[PDB]
Amino acid sequence: IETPYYLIDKAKLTRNMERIAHVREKSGAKALLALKCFATWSVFDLMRDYMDGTTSSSLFEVRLGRERFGKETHAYSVAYGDNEIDEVVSHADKIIFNSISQLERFADKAAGIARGLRLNPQRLGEWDVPKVERVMDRINGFMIHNNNKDFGLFDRMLGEIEERFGALIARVDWVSLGGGIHFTGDDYPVDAFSARLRAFSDRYGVQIYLEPGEASITKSTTLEVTVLDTLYNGKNLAIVDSSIEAHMLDLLIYRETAKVLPNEGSHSYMICGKSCLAGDVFGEFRFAEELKVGDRISFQDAAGYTMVKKNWFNGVKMPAIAIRELDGSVRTVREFTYADYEQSLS
Amino acid sequence: MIETPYYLIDKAKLTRNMERIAHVREKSGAKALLALKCFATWSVFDLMRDYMDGTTSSSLFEVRLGRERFGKETHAYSVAYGDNEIDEVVSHADKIIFNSISQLERFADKAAGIARGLRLNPQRLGEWDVPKVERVMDRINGFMIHNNCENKDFGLFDRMLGEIEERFGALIARVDWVSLGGGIHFTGDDYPVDAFSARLRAFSDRYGVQIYLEPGEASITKSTTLEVTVLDTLYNKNLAIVDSSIEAHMLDLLIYRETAKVLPNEGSHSYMICGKSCLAGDVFGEFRFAEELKVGDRISFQDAAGYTMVKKNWFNGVKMPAIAIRELDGSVRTVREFTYADYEQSLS
Numbered sequence: 001i002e003t004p005y006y007l008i009d010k011a012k013l014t015r016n017m018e019r020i021a022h023v024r025e026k027s028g029a030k031a032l033l034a035l036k037c038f039a040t041w042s043v044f045d046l047m048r049d050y051m052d053g054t055t056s057s058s059l060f061e062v063r064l065g066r067e068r069f070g071k072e073t074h075a076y077s078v079a080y081g082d083n084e085i086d087e088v089v090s091h092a093d094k095i096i097f098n099s100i101s102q103l104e105r106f107a108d109k110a111a112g113i114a115r116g117l118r119l120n121p122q123r124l125g126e127w128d129v130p131k132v133e134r135v136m137d138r139i140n141g142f143m144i145h146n147n148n149k150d151f152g153l154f155d156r157m158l159g160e161i162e163e164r165f166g167a168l169i170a171r172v173d174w175v176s177l178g179g180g181i182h183f184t185g186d187d188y189p190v191d192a193f194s195a196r197l198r199a200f201s202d203r204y205g206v207q208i209y210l211e212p213g214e215a216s217i218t219k220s221t222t223l224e225v226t227v228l229d230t231l232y233n234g235k236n237l238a239i240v241d242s243s244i245e246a247h248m249l250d251l252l253i254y255r256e257t258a259k260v261l262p263n264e265g266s267h268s269y270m271i272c273g274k275s276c277l278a279g280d281v282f283g284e285f286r287f288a289e290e291l292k293v294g295d296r297i298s299f300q301d302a303a304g305y306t307m308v309k310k311n312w313f314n315g316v317k318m319p320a321i322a323i324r325e326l327d328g329s330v331r332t333v334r335e336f337t338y339a340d341y342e343q344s345l346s
Numbered sequence: 347m348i349e350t351p352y353y354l355i356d357k358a359k360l361t362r363n364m365e366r367i368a369h370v371r372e373k374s375g376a377k378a379l380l381a382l383k384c385f386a387t388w389s390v391f392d393l394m395r396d397y398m399d400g401t402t403s404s405s406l407f408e409v410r411l412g413r414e415r416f417g418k419e420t421h422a423y424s425v426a427y428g429d430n431e432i433d434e435v436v437s438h439a440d441k442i443i444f445n446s447i448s449q450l451e452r453f454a455d456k457a458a459g460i461a462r463g464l465r466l467n468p469q470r471l472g473e474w475d476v477p478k479v480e481r482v483m484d485r486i487n488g489f490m491i492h493n494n495c496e497n498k499d500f501g502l503f504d505r506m507l508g509e510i511e512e513r514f515g516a517l518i519a520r521v522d523w524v525s526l527g528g529g530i531h532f533t534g535d536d537y538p539v540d541a542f543s544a545r546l547r548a549f550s551d552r553y554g555v556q557i558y559l560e561p562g563e564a565s566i567t568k569s570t571t572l573e574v575t576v577l578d579t580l581y582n583k584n585l586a587i588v589d590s591s592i593e594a595h596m597l598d599l600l601i602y603r604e605t606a607k608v609l610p611n612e613g614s615h616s617y618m619i620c621g622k623s624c625l626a627g628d629v630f631g632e633f634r635f636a637e638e639l640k641v642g643d644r645i646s647f648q649d650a651a652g653y654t655m656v657k658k659n660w661f662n663g664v665k666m667p668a669i670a671i672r673e674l675d676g677s678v679r680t681v682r683e684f685t686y687a688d689y690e691q692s693l694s
Contacts, residue, residue: 060663079577229426317409
């Protein structure tokens with residue numbers, strides 16, 4: 001009810017889930033939710049019916065995956081600590097190491113569960129075939145990541161990978177290929193994409209893992225804000241009860257804008273957060289009627305990489321997490337209060 | 347005992363800052379308020395209280411935090427007040443400041459019981475047009491002006507204060523308090539603290555106003571470190587991974603694309619030190635070390651108190667750093683440890 005709040009629509013999430021289900025059946029591949037992108041666990045009950053588990057990159061994520069999602073739990077991390085590696089292992093079905101040194105340091109601890117290594121086919125992952133051959137005895141699979149704007153690109157990226165590591169991929173029995181692939185987008189060639197995954201899986205005799213983050217949750221969630229103030233300094237301005245630094249940090253980090261629908265009308269306003277930063281700007285949009293204090297605005301496609309990195313910048317009110325249920329009913333899962341804010345600080 | 351990462355607030359170094367602040371307050375008669383947007387680690391407010399005059403805030407939660415845990419004078423500011431909040435803001439604040447005439451006109455009635463101020467823009471933040479201001483002088487009492495930024499030079503501050511008199515001098519004389527904001531690094535070693543106090547005196551004397559300073563960074567400068575461990579070593583440059591992330595823990599470094607600080611930054615092993623994140627740009631900096639870095643080695647990022655703790659997050663689910671204090675003793679007291687349940691509870 002009270003702005004700001006993230007709103008996840010179960011129906012829109014459903015549509016994506018049904019699209020993942022088809023890809024899984026058509027492709028033979030398994031789809032794991034990338035928790036680094038989306039970890040709002042109160043909707044896992046829905047998502048788990050359609051996916052194969054989760055993929056994580058920290059202790060907290062692998063634990064959340066095991067306790068709230070279940071099914072297959074993969075564990076990755078750029079680097080594990082000695083202090084945490086046992087608990088990571090206890091939660092994971094598979095563990096993937098970023099490097100050989102890491103592999104060598106922890107493989108003994110990860111006895112009992114399938115172990116993997118990340119390969120780099122161009123930072124992260126090994127590249128040196130001859131070097132990797134020496135540890136083949138210790139691992140079961142690979143994570144190979146390189147993201148896909150179109151499908152043509154993916155196909156090429158996949159080829160580039162055979163040429164690099166085909167010989168190695170042949171001697172193992174699973175591979176995960178990461179995310180970046182928009183195979184839940186309306187006009188994506190799902191059939192050809194699946195065919196291609198079967199070709200790779202038959203050739204090498206491996207189980208393919210997909211790690212959709214964005215594709216799991218595109219166009220399912222909105223950020224609902226209220227207009228607090230309106231003004232003219234070169235352009236029509238509107239300030240809303242939100243801040244891109246606190247609530248949509250990727251906009252700021254990557255100097256991107258938000259989405260509003262429809263983006264039509266005669267009045268364009270540039271939309272800003274409740275703070276005084278140069279950058280604090282959702283973007284510039286069009287509306288049919290003039291903006292007034294009290295008006296409601298929805299930023300679209302706000303589920304990925306946002307709630308997972310919201311913060312208390314300036315002590316601005318943190319947006320509640322809410323769900324629209326399949327029947328149209330809207331319920332609040334989580335309100336953040338003064339207490340939350342105070343406890344984050346000491 | 348304590349594991350990395352953690353932010354370590356050095357009690358003795360923080361106090362050094364606090365004493366230089368007091369000295370200014372004493373010499374100048376100006377008052378100093380901690381800017382909560384920079385630093386709001388309230389477990390050390392008891393230490394800062396006796397050297398400062400209050401807090402300034404830019405949100406409901408900040409004004410409440412300053413009133414409830416800091417005490418003394420609380421100032422409220424916002425770019426845009428919410429109607430469902432204003433009344434609560436007013437009840438915590440001693441002074442309230444509005445960004446624009448319209449905000450003031452809008453909220454005048456609700457703020458009637460306390461001193462009201464208006465932000466002035468010397469250069470969408472503050473009013474610049476004297477005539478429009480003048481029409482609303484029967485409703486305020488004070489001005490806020492915050493131009494300085496990383497201002498580490500007294501000469502430059504001196505000129506900025508000069509251009510302030512020329513644009514608004516006539517109006518300033520007529521009110522009874524002014525806040526000169528923050529961004530002024532008067533707690534730096536070698537700053538002409540007494541010249542600066544004397545310049546504060548003269549402005550306050552000429553205009554018959556009480557001066558407020560809003561030091562954020564200057565309260566907390568060089569007081570705090572972020573302690574980390576190396577977890578893996580790699581040869582791509584030489585690379586070392588630490589148990590932290592600039593995105594989650596020192597987000598200003600990512601936002602502004604700056605690098606962290608190490609001591610001494612010397613020796614002939616040059617390392618890129620990177621965070622535990624997946625992200626490409628999760629890099630603290632290229633540093634010099636005297637000896638080859640090994641898994642287990644401890645690294646301290648310097649000057650990590652400002653704009654760090656207030657904006658930390660759970661990106662990647664990486665472990666959030668504990669909050670700790672180095673006491674006089676030299677012992678480390680753990681104030682707050684973030685656990686799985688904090689992470690889980692932030693997501694649903």
